[PDB]
Amino acid sequence: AVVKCKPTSPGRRHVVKVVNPELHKGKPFAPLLEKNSKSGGRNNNGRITTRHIGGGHKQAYRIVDFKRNKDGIPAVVERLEYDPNRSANIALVLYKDGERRYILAPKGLKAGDQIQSGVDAAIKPGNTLPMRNIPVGSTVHNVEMKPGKGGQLARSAGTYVQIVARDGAYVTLRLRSGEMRKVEADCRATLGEVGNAEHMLRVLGKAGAARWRGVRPTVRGTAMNPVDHPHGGGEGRNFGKHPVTPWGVQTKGKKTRSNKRTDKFIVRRRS
Template sequence: KAGRNVNGHITMRHQGGGHKQHYRIVDFRRDKDGISAKVERLEYDPNRSANLALLCYADGERRYIIAAKGLAAGTQLLSGAEAPIKPGNTLPLRNIPVGTTVHCVEMQPGKGAQLARAAGASVQLLAREGSYAQVRLRSGEIRKVHVDCRATIGEVGNEEHSLESIGKAGRVRWRGVRPTVRGVAMNPIDHPHGGGEGKTAAGQDP
């Protein structure tokens, strides 16, 4: 069962069950430079809020990437320093104009994207000074990132993910989330709020 440690004790509540999922290997490095790729199709991914785009490169290789907003089947993409500035293309920060909205930003050159990967996420390139660039995250935090780190133009697609109505309790269970029991509904042994006849106020430790 999920959420248990080596002794079988629950260490993380509300985990378990859920539908079986296959993990999709996503290309966060985008290191096939200079080889054009065509978006074959957009796919759902149960492992993340964003959708995936399946790319077919000119040499026949296929890779998944995080689908940028505005991508559709048939879109041509390119990565590398020479790539044009259009959504879905990946370039080093040194080659991206200041003020551009980007996503899937690396924090160390060559490590793969770590920032702004969720549905609807984006960061803004604010400035470049020497070998570092400044990016503003959605939280308002401003981070310094090396200019050789790569970023993808545009923002992540599926931006209405947060507005989606789950509809029923069962859909939460499909995602592997178990119910949250209120402390007041428990016995005294299980919770400080537990026990009592009827509804009683929580006792305060003096």
């Protein structure tokens, strides 16, 4: 649930927590963990390639299963867990054969729930099956774009995709953006919405919170000198130019999709 924190200090006043009690209070499943060091938004050349990334808390990498290939073995959900690497919550499941995996926790899922991958599997939340097997009109998440690859669409805290149509070897998805997109019908997909839907109701409430999430501050181009950004300079507050990136490209409105290889799959762009 969302919880507005009492204003016992400024910087706590405007804080709203999203507190789920059903998460695992404990150390995560250590076999599925692995190291994940921070970039600082800097590439192999050592240059900053993406501004405003830096610091934040140490995090392990939970190895989430997005491919979801244990066909026919029924799994049972052991627990829901906090993943620092994503807006969703993950769920530690236990297959009948003794293997454990992390998956994206879907909306209704909780400890004890049984889930299943495969063509044969029951059309119920958390179950995973090819989109030719999934009924049209259903909400799905963790959608593969290429068969066998692993789920790429609808992974974020409260997302889901609608299967609007199945026309032969393809199905048309209504993506969360509003883009309609053709996808091969043999591509896999998990039933239902992804879990942590009140994630968006959280409000950080102070500068420090942002920092804790590894986000360094962002300086406004207009606050700079002309040598630094296109918006810089001016005595007092001036801004007599069309908005643009730090590299001079228009920012308010100018489209930047150039991919002519996948234009065929996009049925309708978002609006």
